[PDB]
Amino acid sequence: SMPFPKDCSQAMLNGDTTSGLYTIYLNGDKAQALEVFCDMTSDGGGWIVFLRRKNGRENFYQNWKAYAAGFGDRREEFWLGLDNLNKITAQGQYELRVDLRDHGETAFAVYDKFSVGDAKTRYKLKVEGYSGTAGDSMAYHNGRSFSTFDKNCALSYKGAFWYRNCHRVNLMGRYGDNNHSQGVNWFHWKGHEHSIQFAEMKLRPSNFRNL
Ligand SMILES: Cc1nnc(N2CCCCC2)s1
Fold first, then answer.
1. Domain residue spans in the chain?
2. Broken C–N links (> 2.5 Å) in the chain, after residues
3. Which of 55, 99, 167, 204 is most exposed by smallest CB count within 10 Å?
């Protein structure tokens, strides 16, 4: 085992094959501990989960400071935090996976290159290298800064995202809201009038597929 795993890929290689809560260490630094949920079963495992929607119990209509820091129960609905995402994606080349499920249908999207910039970029999204079944809805968002109601797409749709004008992906939108563009949307899978029951966003090193 690696003593200070920097992501769920180094925790899985450490023999942690059960999905659940693990400690990672940003930059391998024992003073930068972070408790994350690791999805150890989806497409070979080793994924830090950073967004989960599943039941509408958590409020995602939150401010800049909340999106920067993270909120929620990492075992249920939560957001990991943009500062966390910036610090993880800085450690190497990461891949994004999005898992969607709605009324028994499933879809996914993988992006070979995923990064989140620092606060001076307003946590700029980079997403490149799509494959999947959900349809490439993140392309629309590529290169955009993060927006919250207090930093208006976030206000109009009562969510938070790397909004443009405004979204094809709205996974931090209002749970169970089928009104146009209000809900948990992945446009190129289920459009803007269908809120998705289950959604996860997760990341691991792009080179994990052959490490
Ligand atoms: C079901 C699936 N979940 N993930 C999949 N892929 C990820 C790697 C590229 C294509 C396969 S197929």
1. 1-134+198-211, 135-197
2. 151
3. 55
